[PDB]
Structure formats: C-alpha cells, structure tokens
Scaffold this motif. Sequence first.
Motif, mmCIF file in Angstrom:
data_model
loop_
_atom_site.group_PDB
_atom_site.id
_atom_site.type_symbol
_atom_site.label_atom_id
_atom_site.label_comp_id
_atom_site.label_asym_id
_atom_site.label_seq_id
_atom_site.Cartn_x
_atom_site.Cartn_y
_atom_site.Cartn_z
ATOM 1 N N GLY C 9 24.825 -1.640 27.467
ATOM 2 C CA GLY C 9 24.934 -0.285 27.975
ATOM 3 C C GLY C 9 24.755 -0.238 29.476
ATOM 4 O O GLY C 9 25.166 -1.145 30.205
ATOM 5 N N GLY C 11 21.506 1.550 31.907
ATOM 6 C CA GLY C 11 20.339 2.400 31.965
ATOM 7 C C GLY C 11 19.558 2.491 30.673
ATOM 8 O O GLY C 11 18.463 3.065 30.672
ATOM 9 N N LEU C 12 20.082 1.940 29.581
ATOM 10 C CA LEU C 12 19.385 1.922 28.297
ATOM 11 C C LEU C 12 19.949 0.776 27.476
ATOM 12 O O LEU C 12 21.155 0.742 27.216
ATOM 13 C CB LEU C 12 19.554 3.248 27.555
ATOM 14 C CG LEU C 12 18.520 4.345 27.793
ATOM 15 C CD1 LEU C 12 18.921 5.618 27.078
ATOM 16 C CD2 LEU C 12 17.159 3.883 27.323
ATOM 17 N N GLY C 154 26.620 4.643 33.418
ATOM 18 C CA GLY C 154 27.274 3.754 34.354
ATOM 19 C C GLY C 154 28.675 4.168 34.751
ATOM 20 O O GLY C 154 29.024 4.118 35.934
ATOM 21 N N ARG C 206 15.260 12.067 36.778
ATOM 22 C CA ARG C 206 16.093 11.905 35.592
ATOM 23 C C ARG C 206 15.532 12.685 34.412
ATOM 24 O O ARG C 206 16.287 13.290 33.642
ATOM 25 C CB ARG C 206 16.221 10.424 35.240
ATOM 26 C CG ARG C 206 17.006 10.156 33.974
ATOM 27 C CD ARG C 206 17.010 8.680 33.644
ATOM 28 N NE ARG C 206 15.659 8.162 33.471
ATOM 29 C CZ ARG C 206 14.947 8.290 32.361
ATOM 30 N NH1 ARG C 206 15.428 8.914 31.300
ATOM 31 N NH2 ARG C 206 13.722 7.776 32.315
ATOM 32 N N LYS C 209 16.335 16.266 34.869
ATOM 33 C CA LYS C 209 17.745 16.476 34.555
ATOM 34 C C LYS C 209 17.969 16.548 33.051
ATOM 35 O O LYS C 209 18.687 17.424 32.557
ATOM 36 C CB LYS C 209 18.582 15.352 35.162
ATOM 37 C CG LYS C 209 20.067 15.470 34.902
ATOM 38 C CD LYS C 209 20.820 14.352 35.594
ATOM 39 C CE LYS C 209 20.579 13.025 34.899
ATOM 40 N NZ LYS C 209 21.202 12.978 33.553
ATOM 41 N N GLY C 297 28.543 9.113 24.290
ATOM 42 C CA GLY C 297 27.783 8.775 25.472
ATOM 43 C C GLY C 297 26.671 9.769 25.759
ATOM 44 O O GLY C 297 26.702 10.926 25.344
ATOM 45 N N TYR C 302 24.838 17.360 27.471
ATOM 46 C CA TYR C 302 24.393 18.601 28.087
ATOM 47 C C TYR C 302 24.722 19.784 27.180
ATOM 48 O O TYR C 302 25.770 19.797 26.530
ATOM 49 C CB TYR C 302 25.057 18.802 29.448
ATOM 50 C CG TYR C 302 24.522 17.908 30.539
ATOM 51 C CD1 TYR C 302 24.772 16.548 30.529
ATOM 52 C CD2 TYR C 302 23.759 18.422 31.577
ATOM 53 C CE1 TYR C 302 24.292 15.724 31.519
ATOM 54 C CE2 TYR C 302 23.270 17.602 32.572
ATOM 55 C CZ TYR C 302 23.540 16.254 32.536
ATOM 56 O OH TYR C 302 23.058 15.430 33.521
ATOM 57 N N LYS C 332 24.717 9.903 21.707
ATOM 58 C CA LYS C 332 24.156 8.825 22.514
ATOM 59 C C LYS C 332 24.273 7.481 21.810
ATOM 60 O O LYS C 332 24.607 6.470 22.438
ATOM 61 C CB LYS C 332 22.697 9.128 22.851
ATOM 62 C CG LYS C 332 22.081 8.156 23.845
ATOM 63 C CD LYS C 332 20.616 8.463 24.090
ATOM 64 C CE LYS C 332 20.449 9.736 24.894
ATOM 65 N NZ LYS C 332 19.044 9.919 25.342
HETATM 66 N N1 LIG Z 1 19.813 15.392 26.548
HETATM 67 C C1 LIG Z 1 20.395 14.933 27.681
HETATM 68 N N2 LIG Z 1 20.902 15.781 28.598
HETATM 69 C C2 LIG Z 1 21.481 15.332 29.726
HETATM 70 N N3 LIG Z 1 21.607 14.032 30.039
HETATM 71 C C3 LIG Z 1 21.137 13.075 29.210
HETATM 72 C C4 LIG Z 1 20.493 13.484 27.956
HETATM 73 N N4 LIG Z 1 20.124 12.357 27.326
HETATM 74 C C5 LIG Z 1 20.502 11.317 28.107
HETATM 75 N N5 LIG Z 1 21.106 11.745 29.228
HETATM 76 C C6 LIG Z 1 21.639 10.871 30.298
HETATM 77 O O1 LIG Z 1 22.366 9.799 29.703
HETATM 78 C C7 LIG Z 1 22.013 8.556 30.305
HETATM 79 C C8 LIG Z 1 21.942 7.474 29.238
HETATM 80 O O2 LIG Z 1 23.271 7.052 28.953
HETATM 81 P P1 LIG Z 1 23.558 5.827 27.957
HETATM 82 O O3 LIG Z 1 24.101 6.378 26.664
HETATM 83 O O4 LIG Z 1 22.344 4.937 27.959
HETATM 84 O O5 LIG Z 1 24.736 5.061 28.738
HETATM 85 P P2 LIG Z 1 25.175 3.569 28.333
HETATM 86 O O6 LIG Z 1 25.627 3.694 26.897
HETATM 87 O O7 LIG Z 1 26.282 3.241 29.302
HETATM 88 O O8 LIG Z 1 23.923 2.753 28.532
HETATM 89 C C9 LIG Z 1 20.685 8.763 31.003
HETATM 90 O O9 LIG Z 1 20.751 8.220 32.322
HETATM 91 C C10 LIG Z 1 20.492 10.260 31.080
HETATM 92 O O10 LIG Z 1 20.568 10.675 32.446
#
Ligand SMILES: Nc1ncnc2c1ncn2[C@@H]1O[C@H](COP(=O)(O)OP(=O)(O)O)[C@@H](O)[C@H]1O
Lengths: 57, 242, 371, 371
Positions: C9, C11-12, C154, C206, C209, C297, C302, C332
């Motif tokens: 991924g 950031g996670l 990303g 973050r 946000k 994603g 939001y 997610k």
């Molecule tokens: N409930 C939410 N509302 C807004 N933004 C969110 C929420 N949950 C997660 N995020 C954003 O999503 C990002 C995580 O994305 P992620 O699915 O981990 O991407 P990837 O799959 O590329 O690792 C975090 O940086 C966060 O800012």
Amino acid sequence: EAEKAADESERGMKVIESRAQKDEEKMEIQEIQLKEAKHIAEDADRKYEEVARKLVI
Amino acid sequence: RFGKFIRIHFGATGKLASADIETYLLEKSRVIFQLKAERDYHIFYQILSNKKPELLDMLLITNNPYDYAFISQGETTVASIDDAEELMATDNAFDVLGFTSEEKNSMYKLTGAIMHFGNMKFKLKQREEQAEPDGTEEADKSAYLMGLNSADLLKGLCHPRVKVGNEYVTKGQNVQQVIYATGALAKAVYERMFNWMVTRINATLETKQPRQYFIGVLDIAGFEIFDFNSFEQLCINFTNEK
Amino acid sequence: TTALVCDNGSGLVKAGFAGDDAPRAVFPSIVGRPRHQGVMVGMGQKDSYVGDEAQSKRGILTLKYPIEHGIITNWDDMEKIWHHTFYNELRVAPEEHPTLLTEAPLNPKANREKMTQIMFETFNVPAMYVAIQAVLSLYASGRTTGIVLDSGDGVTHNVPIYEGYALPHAIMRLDLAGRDLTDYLMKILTERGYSFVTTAEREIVRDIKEKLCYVALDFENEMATAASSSSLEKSYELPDGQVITIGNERFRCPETLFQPSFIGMESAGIHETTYNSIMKCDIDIRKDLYANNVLSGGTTMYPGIADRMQKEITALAPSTMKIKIIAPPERKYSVWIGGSILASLSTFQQMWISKQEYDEAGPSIVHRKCF
Amino acid sequence: TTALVCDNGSGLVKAGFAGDDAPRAVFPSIVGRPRHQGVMVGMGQKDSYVGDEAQSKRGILTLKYPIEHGIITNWDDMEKIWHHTFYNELRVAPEEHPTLLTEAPLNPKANREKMTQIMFETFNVPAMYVAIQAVLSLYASGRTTGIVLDSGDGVTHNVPIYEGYALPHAIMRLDLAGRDLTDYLMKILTERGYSFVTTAEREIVRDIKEKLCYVALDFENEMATAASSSSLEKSYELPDGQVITIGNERFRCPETLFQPSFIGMESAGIHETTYNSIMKCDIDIRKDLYANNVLSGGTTMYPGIADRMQKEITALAPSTMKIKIIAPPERKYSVWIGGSILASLSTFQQMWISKQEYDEAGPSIVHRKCF
Ligand SMILES: Nc1ncnc2c1ncn2[C@@H]1O[C@H](COP(=O)(O)OP(=O)(O)O)[C@@H](O)[C@H]1O
Ligand SMILES: Nc1ncnc2c1ncn2[C@@H]1O[C@H](COP(=O)(O)OP(=O)(O)O)[C@@H](O)[C@H]1O
Ligand SMILES: [Mg+2]
Ligand SMILES: [Mg+2]
C-alpha cells in the motif's frame, strides 16, 4: 438538545424517505408513459411518411 | 441420511462394559433445498400434527403447511408413516429419559424458530445497492422466541460487523448474500442441535464401567442411483466409492 | 500449505493469510529514528522503531515514509517494514508461504524487479506474484465489468475493465492523493493561527483530516453559508489540550480532489478524469461502465464524496444514462479482500512465479505473461 | 425423415427444418476474437465468439465476416459458423439429416467443391444439394416465369426464368450490395462530424442505414427540398447517448444502387442492368418478363424502392408494355421459404447427392450432370 435533534432527524428522515419512494414511483410511471408517448409519436410519423409517399406516387 | 456409528466397549476381562454412539456426515442441504418429489426431515411434519394443540398455539405456528416456504417446495405429505403416534412415542421416550420437559420445550421452540426463517423478506433501498427489510412481524416473533431483539438481529443481518486489525468495521450485504446467510444460519443451528442431542444421548447412555477395546458398528447410506442425480447424491456416491 | 497476501500500500501496510475475510495486521508504514542524544544508561534504546511502535514514540522520532507515490524510494526501510510484518505481526516463517503482492499501475519496471529480487533472496519465499490494485478491487466488489477508481494515500488511478478484459490505453493515473490533502490542510490551517511543521504533527493533522473533513455537494453555496452561519464549526482535542475550532477549512481540504488547481496541479479533478477514461474506451461498452462505477481506497472514504461525484458525472454525461456509483462500506480494505479471493482460487495455483523459474530466467521473469 | 435448409448468404445465416413456414434460427454470420489480454483469471474466456454471441461483445472483439462477396475466403470461420448452426441454434445432429444449400450464380467452382467436401467429411451428412438463390425465391413467390432480383448483402444478381427454363446467357451479376452501402454511409457521415472507424461500430452504422435510409422517387427534387427546408431530418440515439441527426445523407446512401458512380464503379445502375437483362433474352417472352418482376433480398427492403424502380424501368421500357413489380413483405426470408418448399417436394427426393455417390465419384460429382 442532542437527543431532541436526534428525534428531529429520525422523523425527518422517515418523512423524506416516504416522499422519496413516492417520487420513485412517480418518476417510474412517467418514464413508462414517456416510452408509450414516444412509440406512438414515431408510429404516427412513419405511418404518415408512408401514406404521403403513396399520395405523391 | 446420517452415518450412524456405535462403539461397543468391553471390560478388562473381556466382558460387556458400555456403549458409545457417534454421528457423521449429516446432510444439511436437505433442510433448505428438496427435490420436487421428495420430502424434508420428518421433524417439521411431525410438529405440524394437530393432535397436540398446545404446541401450535404457544409457538404461534400456522397450521397450514402450504404457507411455510421452506416446506411447501417439496412434496407436502405422503402415506409413509402416520406421524401422530410416532411423535407421541418420541415424546414419551424423551419423557422417560434423564432430562426434564423444559429441554424438550426448548427443542420444539427452536425448531419452530428454524421454521420461521423462511418468512424473512428483503428489498433494495432508495438510491443504494444495500438491502433493507420490509416486513418485520415474522422477525419480531422469531426474536421473541429466541429471546433476542428484532432490531439488533435485523441490524446484524443487514450490516455484519467484522474485525480488521484492531478496529471493527461494518460490511454491506445485498439481497442474495443475506438470503444465503439466512439459509446458512438455519442449517448450522440445526446441525448444532443434532450434535448436542447426540451428546446428551451418549451421556445418558454412559455407564461407569471402564472402556477397554471396542467393537465398532457402522451404518451408512448406500450407493443410491436416480435418473435425476444431483449434488446430494454425488456426495453419497463419492462416500460409497471411498 | 496456505498462501500469504501482503499489501504494501502507501501509508498503511496490511497483510494476512489467504482465505481470510479481513487482514489480521494493519499498521502505518513508518520508520522512525531517534533525533536526540539520550542520557539514561542501561536501557539500551534500539536505533530504529518500525511500524505501529513508532506511533507511540512519535514525539522523539523523525518519521520517514519509505515510499512517496507507489515507488519505493528507501529500500532498506522497506526490508525493515517487510521483516517486521513477517515476524512481529504475523509470526510466520515466509520460507513455506507463497506471497502475493499488490502494486500500482504505470510504475517503473525496476521497482517490480527489485521487489521480486528482495522477496526471493532476503526472505527465500518459495513463490510469489504481483497484481494490480484495481483488479483486486473489482474482485472484492462482486463485479466483472465497470471502471474502478482506486484512491489511496499514494496515488489515484482509474482502470476500466469490461468482461474481465482490461483497456490499457484508457488507464489514467493522477498523483494527487491523501498525503497532498494533508499537506494542503497544513497550508490552510495556518491562516487561522495553528502552525504544524514537525513530522510528528503530520500524524495529528492527518487525524484531524480523517475525523472532521467532508466533501460538500456545492462549493459556492457552502462557502456562502459558512460566511454567515457558524453551524459548520467543530472543535478538536489536541493530545495536550488547547482545543482548536475549524470552520470552512473542514470542507475545503477535500475539494482539492475536485479542484486540483488549489495546490497548483495542472490536471483536472477525479470526476473529470473518470469521464475522460470512460470516453477513452470503445463506444459499445460505455453504458456498462457508466452503470458500474466502483470506488475503493482510503481517500474515497469522505462523507458525501459519492453524491458529489455522481452529480458531477451526471452533469458531464448525456442525460439519457443512469449513473450509479458503488461505495461499499469497506472501501479501505477492498484491495486486500480481492487479494484474498484471488489467492484462494484453485486455478491460480499454476500462475505463481516459482523459485526455479526465477533462478532460471533471472529477475526479468516478472514482465512475462505472469504479469 | 426431415431435411435441413441452410442459407449461408452473407452477413446473415438463416436455417431451419424443411416444411416449416419460416426459418427457425436467424443470426449474423460473424466470428469475433478478443483483441485484449484479460486481467481477471479463472473466468476462462473462449478464444472465439461466434454467431449472435459476438453481437453482445462488440466492444472487446474484432469482427470478421467469413464471406466477402458470395464466396468464402476464411474456411475455418465458415466451419465454425456451420458447427454453431448445427449444434447450438438447431441442436440437431446432422448425422441423419440431409441439407439443402444455396449460393449465388457465377461463383468459382473451387468454392462449391470445397463446401461439398467439408460437408461430407467434417459433418458426415447423408446427402446434400446446392441450389441457386434466385430459383428458390422464384418458388417462394408462387410463380413460374419472370425475372428475380436477389439483392443481398454480398452480391446482387438477376436470373430471368420463363416457364421453368432458365436462360444462362442473360444472367447479370453485380458486386454492389448492402456492405458497400454501409461503407458508403460510413464515409459520407464524416462530413457531418461523426467518425466511425472500428469494425464494431460498423454494426451501429448498419443500424442507422436499416432504420432511417429510404429511396427517393426523384433525386434532384429531394436534393432541393433538403437544401431548402429541414423537414427530412431525423435523429438517432447512439448506444452511448449523444443523439445525432442525419439530413441529406438519409437518401444518398441507397441511391448508390441506381448511381453506382458514387462509389467509383463503372457498371450501370440496378434498373439499367435489369432492363439490359430483359432485352438480352428472346423477343417472344419479353412481355411476360416485364409483367413478372420479382424482388428479394434484404437490400430491396428500402421504403419506396419499388416505386422508383418501376418508374425507371417504365421510362426505359416501351410505353405499350405493362410493367409490374412484385414486392412481398417477406423479401428477406423469401429464399429460405423457397428452399423449404423445394425440399418438401416428393419428386426432389431423387436429386440428393448420396454419400456413396460422392465417395464413388469424388468431389467433382456436384458439377457433373448429377447436379
Ligand atoms: N474516514 C476517512 N476519511 C478521510 N480520509 C481517510 C479516512 N480513512 C483513511 N483516510 C485516508 O486514507 C489514507 C490511507 O489510504 P490507504 O488505503 O492506506 O492507501 P494505500 O492502499 O495506497 O496504502 C490515509 O492517509 C488517510 O489520510
Ligand atoms: N429494411 C432495410 N433497410 C436497409 N437495409 C437493410 C434492410 N433490410 C436488410 N438490409 C441490409 O441487408 C443486409 C442483409 O441482407 P441479406 O439478404 O441477409 O444478405 P444475405 O442473404 O447475403 O445474408 C444487411 O447488411 C442489412 O444492412
Ligand atoms: Mg491502495
Ligand atoms: Mg441471400
């Protein structure tokens, strides 16, 4: 007031979803009658086209 | 259908000591899907016997087998065995057994709850692919019987909670998935009830004699052949071939 | 044996065994180092805190993300992340578990080559495979067609799939993502009086946000409402006190997705890139792509984003089409669910890149038909 | 037993058992191949979509007609078409069913020989026969004299027949047909701003041509009317919206039949070829040939084609000759109806080509007097 607003939200969402399903039924039936109206319009159109071709010939 | 298996134990000096009973390969597909010319398990038909009126009114069971969806798909009734005195004989055997009548009543009420799982209905939402119930009376009565809350059960069916990492999140379900889950729950609870009953019977049968070498007795369904073979027959054929 | 599904991924990092309904371990992909000296003698602090442990010691570490936009930029940190995931999170030996990895479209080939080399050499995994995020997202969504918008932390990209056939020429990639939204939130919070600069406070911004921001259906109307009414203001509790109240800044940060001109990007919003990608495809499949718009994603989480994007696409698209947007609650983790489904398939067992093949053909074997 | 009446034609394969009122299975004769790679695994896509299935997957397939102008150019595709027709649309094994086949006049002998060889070898039919597509249409009209104009999608031909005696020296064949009309419509729709290039959207253009195109009684008058007024414009709804309006192009497409110079061909128009074939015959049968014009084939289904053709031929023919054109509503399926009628005849039972006869005489039996 949080609980009062929650109750306001609950009956508001109830009434708006009732009106929403009413609107879905309404839009569905008017879309249907749109299909029949268009079908009749095109039917009359090409029927008159054919009869006008017959008249000119 | 199920593969009955009895183990007969003996004493140290080669004398009869005790008996141990087990069950295997009980089929769950029969509970929900039945062939057009075949019936379900005798349980549901036996419960619908009219000679015991108290159970029907205390469980609020519709006396017409046609109304229930899980039963009416197959053949409704045949002259195989007169169900009435068979049901009374089973009730008498349970009564003269080791446990009390409250467990029997729990058994009947749980079976009635399994019956009312087919009345559940679900419909699409306003502007979403999610599914929501329309009727709730059958849900209310089932929750009342199980001692649950109808709202909580409906929320669980529509919005199953799942654990991700260290946090709980909610999952979405459409009509097909919720119907499959409803069927799977009904099959699973029936399986657990049958297994618990078998354990209770084994415990009651159990004597305090030591269990040395045993003599097993195995009963299994035969290599059934039809002109309309299906998955249930396929499993039986595969087991017989093994 | 059983297969292992790991999703690096951005950031996670989320991972777990195949055939599971949800990843077992989810934690940020952060490597932190102590920036101070340390005076106590005997405790023996370690020189690198990795994973969720760095969040606890956030106030005395410099948090560095090993990857910027999909591409790994700090490889050693990535060996540390993978070692932590394999040992301290799953407690399994990768010597007897095939590993499935997820990788974004339109990335340098050297990235995949190095990933496979690291997996085969450092961890000696018996077999591995690399897949595209969008395909997994479509797997988990119970669909076979439709255009999917994968917006993580990303990179944001759209991949249109029809009847299991991809359209490579219609794939659009946009580098605007959650990290840029966090940076813009920092840039827009300082106009009220709150300054966040340190990398430790990146996490606080973050969290704000995630907890408070939302997408407005109309921008001008919401700004007009907030200019007079004060009903849009909410308070947040910092980890030390001094609660902060944000007004119109809560719905202005996610507007960068639909208005990338805020942070200087030349490209168009996601609602326009989706429409352009749909019009890139053939004329005979545009209706199905319109009716099967899929979201995935973390960044697409939001509140109210689905309604805004549906309204925008309906404005763009012809009036005779039904525009439907699928937003499952588990956006997610959709990619990992798709990965578990893909790895649990029986016919997939012959598509692994075995150790023998890698040894015989070198790292270049990744770009063969086993894409 | 029963006999199968297969009518390959070009662009539409229609078949059914003999003695039926109408054909049972009608579907386009196209073979589709996936031009993309496919990312989803486990689906197991077939490598060739054949028949009416390919119409539903136009957006991810390339469509190739196995028959260009009457003749077969891709024999594997034709074998696939025949296998699909025998095993899916009709679901009847051809092992115990004779087949009746049709083809256009003046075709290469190799085509007929290879068709016969494939049908005895691959499918092992007990017997088969080949008939001219025009004589069967003459049967289906309940006539025994007159000329028949079989304007299909591949080729257009005229066969004058008087009292059941064909006149080979007066047969005229023209390669202009429905496919050329569709291509011309594709070319002339560009002047209005619509571009159709992919083979998939050729089917769309064919749909517009079928639905809206019509033959004008007078060309100059209709041109002046369209240039002055706008009452002839109609709008068509594309599969992805963006309704388009076609005006002057509405009747320019079918005028190519009477004005072959639009597509560059030197040959004369349909009416002129019909008149030349009429006067190519003897002098004692010209009146009956004039009074029994027969139309068939899909291309002859344009509104007002009969009146225009009658006017043109009356202008060419002497004034003291009565001119009549027979245009039954079932022009498209007339050939198959005639084939069914012919196969239902009792006297025709001795005209079949037995398998033993084919084995003894070789593939050249069909061209022999045992036709
Ligand atoms: N409930 C939410 N509302 C807004 N933004 C969110 C929420 N949950 C997660 N995020 C954003 O999503 C990002 C995580 O994305 P992620 O699915 O981990 O991407 P990837 O799959 O590329 O690792 C975090 O940086 C966060 O800012
Ligand atoms: N009413 C119509 N208007 C315009 N074109 C038509 C009409 N009917 C049929 N066609 C054209 O005729 C062609 C099919 O003719 P057909 O007789 O099936 O040829 P074949 O017998 O060689 O298969 C199609 O390509 C179609 O475009
Ligand atoms: Mg992602
Ligand atoms: Mg024909």
